[PDB]
Amino acid sequence: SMSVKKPKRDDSKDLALCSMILTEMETHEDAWPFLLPVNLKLVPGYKKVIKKPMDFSTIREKLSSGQYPNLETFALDVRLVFDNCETFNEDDSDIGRAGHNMRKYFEKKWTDTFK
């Protein structure tokens, strides 16, 4: 509360560390469904159904331009990518499996880097 604070966690490396995680997600062999925004002119149903599209290139631009206020807003966009994937793609599909695999890969890096 006012004039009452928990000890200050060092957040000075968070930007660099989120960048490194995102590089690792970008370079994973199963990243291909997520590298670029879904083409809303060419994929029937996507625009109406997926209210907030998100992809790795869009996260990269937001990160690079100071549009993430803190490491949690960064994780929310990464998770949005996988939540969108599950919304639109059957589990038993190449893209569906890619999304599950990448979400697991992300969550481990996240825990190991920050928790």
Instruction: Return the C-alpha torsion angle 84, 88, 92, 95, nearest 10.
Output: -60
Q: What are the boundaries of each domain within the chain? A: 1-115
Q: Which pair of tokens denotes residue 59? A: 């996260």
- Exp. method: X-ray
Instruction: Record the resolution, in angstroms.
Output: 1.7
Which CA distances in Å does 80 have to 1, 11, 49, 57? 32, 23, 14, 13
Name the residue with tokens 């038993």: 92
Q: Which pair of tokens denotes residue 64? A: 């690079």
DSSP state, residue 7: -
Using DSSP, state whether 4 is helix, strand or coil: coil
Instruction: Give the burial class of 97: count Cβ atoms within 10 A of its Cβ; 0-12 exposed, 13-18 middle, 19 or more buried.
Output: middle
CATH superfamily of 1-115: Bromodomain-like (1.20.920.10)
